[PDB]
Design a protein around this ligand. Structure first.
Ligand SMILES: [Mg+2]
Ligand SMILES: [Mg+2]
Ligand SMILES: [Mg+2]
Ligand SMILES: [Mg+2]
Ligand SMILES: [Mg+2]
Lengths: 92, 354, 110, 49, 52, 143, 48, 95
RNA sequence: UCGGAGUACAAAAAACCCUCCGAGUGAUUUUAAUCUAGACAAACCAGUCAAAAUAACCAUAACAUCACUUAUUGAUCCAAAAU
């Protein structure tokens, strides 16, 4: 990712943020496709995925909208671990 | 062909003769109660409890505890009676009651609870989360000494570890502050164990932080056997549980066998069985304090595997079993067309010789 | 004649799977004109009062205490008129679930 | 099948391949009477071609 | 008393129809139904009388 | 390779609390001839004696996980009139606290139609809500 | 032209929906209160 | 069925079959459900669906329909755009 | 022709120009969607349930209800409708 020059620097940095899950400790971004028995179709899926990632990262207008369906647990358990975290005295 | 009931039939007790002179519960709720009490008794016929796993049912508990504090029944009773007399006496209090305005000083209730019935509640939470099942295998102890653990999230921030609570690995990147009350003739041992998340060995766990020969309440003064290693669950698997155990020991104990190297970033070197470790030192060590937390993978953990353990980072999925389909039939009868798609291998045409 | 139309086939009400059998989710366990067997754990009730398995597993029959829904007038009345020690019992069908909910597999080592 | 046909030298890739060439190699069979409008090309061997 | 089978039409502008048994001596029927094309709960008014 | 690198393909998670928190576990669908619904991981249960108010949190095992009672000396000694509306509110707050401390944010509460109208219990629910514990558990995934 | 006609019709009448169903709701509520007021004004005239 | 025609001496097909069934190449026959257009207002949503299906015939019926139909209707067809081309072969059938 | 009870005593099925009750619909508004694992039942045709998933609505909102509820029903073709 860092060594790829065909993508702009701001984009190359945002990619390393959103997709860090699929990045590798050697710095490698890794895409994978499965579906078809024909690897032409697979390669095409990969390339289309890459195109789309670069597309959404190169758009500053991306608002990263999040659904409340699977994230309700996240927000509530966050808030509720923040009720306990709220104890204030310095330590270490 | 009649058989003979084995033991009592449920309603055989009450008299059918003269129903009008029998007292009934005209309340739905009274009935509900009586029923739930009846559902808790050990009946002689096939029951829900039997099949659905009361989990060993009756179990004689090998108890490795600290002996329960000895307190006078009658004296305590008298004092409490008195306190309640005094509290009921005030007119101010009654005013607070009728007008629906009152508050309880929660911190004090938390203190009293910690002091009194807390150990038992913490115990049954530990039972619930199966601490005892994975550690001592059969054994229950009541946490007589309260254990206060906390993490530093910043300068002003303190994240407590209560029993069963959730904490993020970011918070746990540093060794925590530990507090409990003992005078010093005392010697203690503190232990932090990752109960699950051992990669190779389903029956084994990881030692994160092991400290020993702890004078009094002094945490840092003790010699550290195994240096603190931050929590590292794996991306796929959810919610590993970490255990803080506190043993009260008599003799000073020295173990070169359990001692680990200072950096100790090898996983084969931290592999642990709380059972065995306790078997060893069983005579001197009696487990006393307990506090534990639930922890799931978060961003910071990635840094561990690469930077410390010099590993690739393992990621997991949750895989559900493939759906069950009946044997395929040559002439599926009266079955929708989409039947043929259930046994389909992959969706792609295949032209065999063509 | 005086008598007419007594003729209709049997509805085949009965109990399709028996205690100890293996079932797959959606199998009909029993079917009935009135409630004879009530649905227990992991057993769904149909609108025709038939019982079907919601999970793959083993069928078990059981006697248990019956505590009717307070929205049901009749049943609450029946319960309310009982002598104070008495408890209604009924017969239930459960499925003890066999397969584990799912497993954790190793996808990729990064 | 097209590849298998070329490999065994039934159809030769040198000259242009149209329907008549496919028929003459008996790689395919057309029966217009059955409303065959011709050959269609499918991707079955794409990766190996 | 007889009932009647009337054809009921969406006010959603989508041509969509469903037939309903309605009391003969009653008023012209109006309902809130589900229209599949617009995928909504919309107002249906009786257009026509099909069966008697 | 690295002796650390060994993993094994199938990861065993012994933690009983796990699949519940993940929402992927099995609730018990069923019954529904009877009441209340037995479908839940955790259930709030409020017992009112003519003397004391007792709020339990149960697991479908019947096992009480975390509870707050008025017979408890900690709560008993601070306040007055064990059976009051006030007491219900109190027990609610205590329970919310202990629940957060226990790591359980969700439970089902199934009151009776007339217990729903009662003030003591409305204020118990309020106390439980402000405490951060949500009633009405999250749905199952691939239920 | 057919597709655009259909879409036009649907948008047009979907804009008109809340007004229609609210108007019909008020109509039916007014009808109910009309009948109930009739039955009460009859009940009191029969009682007297 | 006419087993030997008069003019040609061949075996005729019964067209009444060709209109209501569909023969896949595997030998499975496919049919609509009976009464699926009839009296819809009187029926459940569920039942309506059960009717709207395309379903398979049991062996006996399949042999019957085969006998009532000449060889032409059993040939392998390749239609452009055909919905049913997906379904003509059988897979993973262990018998 | 269709349903309930007996005959048919406890899984199913089970006859008579056998013994008895019924049905060929009302009333009401909660107007009751799409799609699909797996089953019941079954000579065939017909009948029955139903998870998950979508979409509708509280913004994690799918069993029309009552009358013993069970029965209130009719295949192809062909006609009328135009969706
Ligand atoms: Mg009969
Ligand atoms: Mg008969
Ligand atoms: Mg051909
Ligand atoms: Mg069968
Ligand atoms: Mg559903």
């Amino acid at each position: 990712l860092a060594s790829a020059d065909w993508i702009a620097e701001p984009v190359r940095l945002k990619l390393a943020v959103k997709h860090k899950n699929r990045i590798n400790r050697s710095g490698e971004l890794i895409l994978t496709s499965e579906c078809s028995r024909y690897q032409f179709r697979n390669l095409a899926d990969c390339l289309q995925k890459l195109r789309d990632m670069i597309a959404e990262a190169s758009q500053p207008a991306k608002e990263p909208s999040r659904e409340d369906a699977e994230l309700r647990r996240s927000r509530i358990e966050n808030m509720n671990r923040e009720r306990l975290r709220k104890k204030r005295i310095s330590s270490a | 062909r009649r058989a003979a009931p084995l033991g009592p039939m449920p309603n055989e007790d009450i008299d059918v003769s003269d129903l009008e002179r029998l007292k009934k519960y005209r309340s739905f709720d009274r009935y509900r109660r009586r029923a739930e009490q009846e559902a808790r008794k050990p009946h002689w016929w096939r029951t829900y409890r039997e099949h659905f796993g009361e989990e060993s049912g009756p179990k004689d508990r090998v108890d490795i505890g600290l002996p329960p504090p000895k307190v006078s029944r009658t004296q305590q009773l008298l004092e409490r009676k008195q306190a309640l007399r005094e509290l009921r006496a005030n007119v101010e209090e009654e005013r607070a009651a009728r007008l629906q305005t009152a508050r309880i000083p929660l911190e004090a209730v938390r203190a009293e609870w910690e002091r009194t019935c807390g150990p038992y509640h913490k115990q049954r939470l530990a039972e619930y989360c199966g601490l005892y099942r994975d550690l001592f295998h059969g054994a229950t102890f009541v946490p007589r000494v309260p254990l206060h653990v906390a993490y530093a999230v910043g300068e002003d921030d303190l994240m407590p570890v209560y029993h069963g609570n959730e904490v993020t690995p970011t918070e746990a990147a540093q060794a925590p502050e530990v507090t409990y009350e003992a005078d010093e003739g005392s010697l203690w041992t503190l232990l932090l164990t990752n109960l699950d998340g051992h990669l190779l060995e389903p029956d084994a766990e990881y030692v994160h932080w092991l400290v020993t020969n702890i004078p009094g309440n002094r945490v840092t003064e003790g010699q550290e056997t195994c240096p603190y290693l931050p929590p590292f669950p794996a991306r796929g698997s959810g919610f590993h549980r970490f255990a803080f155990l506190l043993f009260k020991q008599d003799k000073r104990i020295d173990f070169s066998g359990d001692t680990r190297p200072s950096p100790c970033y090898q996983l084969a070197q931290r592999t642990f069985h709380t059972f065995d470790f306790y078997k060893k030192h069983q005579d001197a060590m009696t487990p006393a304090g307990l506090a534990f937390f639930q922890c799931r993978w978060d961003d910071s953990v990635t840094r561990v595997f690469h930077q410390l353990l010099d590993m690739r980072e393992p990621v997991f999925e949750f895989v559900r079993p493939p759906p069950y389909h009946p044997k395929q039939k040559r002439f599926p009868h009266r079955q929708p067309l989409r039947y043929l798609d259930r046994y389909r291998d992959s969706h792609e045409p295949t032209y065999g010789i063509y | 004649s005086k008598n007419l139309g007594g003729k209709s086939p049997g509805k085949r009400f009965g109990i399709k799977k028996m205690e100890g059998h293996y079932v797959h989710a959606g199998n009909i366990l029993a079917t009935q004109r009135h409630f004879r067997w009530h649905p227990g754990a992991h057993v769904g009730l149909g609108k025709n009062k038939c019982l079907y398995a919601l999970e793959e597993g083993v069928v078990r029959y059981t006697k248990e205490v019956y505590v009717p829904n307070p929205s049901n007038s009749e049943a609450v009345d029946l319960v309310t008129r009982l002598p104070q020690g008495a408890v209604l019992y009924k017969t239930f069908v459960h499925v003890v679930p066999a397969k584990p909910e799912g497993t954790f597999k190793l996808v990729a080592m990064l | 099948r097209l590849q298998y046909l070329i490999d065994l030298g039934r159809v030769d890739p040198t000259q242009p391949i149209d329907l008549t060439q496919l028929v003459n190699g008996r790689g395919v069979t057309i029966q217009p009477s059955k409303r065959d409008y011709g050959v269609q090309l499918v991707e079955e061997g794409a990766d190996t071609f | 008393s007889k009932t009647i089978l009337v054809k009921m039409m969406s006010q959603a502008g989508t041509g969509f129809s469903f037939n309903t048994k309605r009391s003969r001596l009653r008023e012209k029927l109006t309902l809130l139904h589900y229209d599949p094309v617009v995928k909504k709960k919309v107002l249906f008014v009786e257009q026509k009388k099909i069966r008697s | 390779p690295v002796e650390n690198e060994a993993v094994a393909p199938e990861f065993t998670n012994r933690n009983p609390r796990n699949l519940e928190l993940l929402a992927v576990a099995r609730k018990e669908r069923g019954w529904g001839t009877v009441w209340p619904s037995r479908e839940f991981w955790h259930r709030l249960r409020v017992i009112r004696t003519q003397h004391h108010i007792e709020a339990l949190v149960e697991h479908r095992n019947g096992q009480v996980v975390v509870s707050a009672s008025t017979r408890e000396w900690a709560i008993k000694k601070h306040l007055y009139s064990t059976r009051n509306v006030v007491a219900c509110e109190s027990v609610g707050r205590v329970l919310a606290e202990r629940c957060l401390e226990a790591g359980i944010n969700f439970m089902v509460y199934h009151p009776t139609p007339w217990e729903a109208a009662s003030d003591s219990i409305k204020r118990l629910q309020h106390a439980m809500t402000e405490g951060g514990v949500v009633l009405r558990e999250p749905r199952r995934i691939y239920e | 032209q057919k597709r655009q006609a259909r879409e036009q019709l649907i948008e047009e009448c979907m804009a008109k929906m809340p007004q229609m169903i609210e108007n019909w709701r008020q109509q039916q509520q007014e009808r109910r209160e009309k009948e109930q007021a009739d039955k009460d004004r009859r009940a009191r005239l029969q009682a007297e | 069925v006419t087993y030997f025609s008069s003019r040609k001496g061949k075996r005729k097909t019964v067209k009444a079959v060709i209109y209501r069934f569909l023969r896949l190449h595997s030998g499975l026959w496919l049919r609509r459900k009976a009464g699926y257009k009839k009296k819809l207002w009187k029926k459940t949503a569920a039942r309506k669906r059960r009717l709207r299906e395309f379903v398979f015939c049991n062996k006996t019926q399949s042999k019957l329909l085969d006998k009532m139909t000449t060889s032409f209707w059993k040939r392998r067809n390749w239609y452009a755009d055909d919905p049913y081309q997906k379904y003509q072969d059988r897979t993973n059938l262990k018998v």
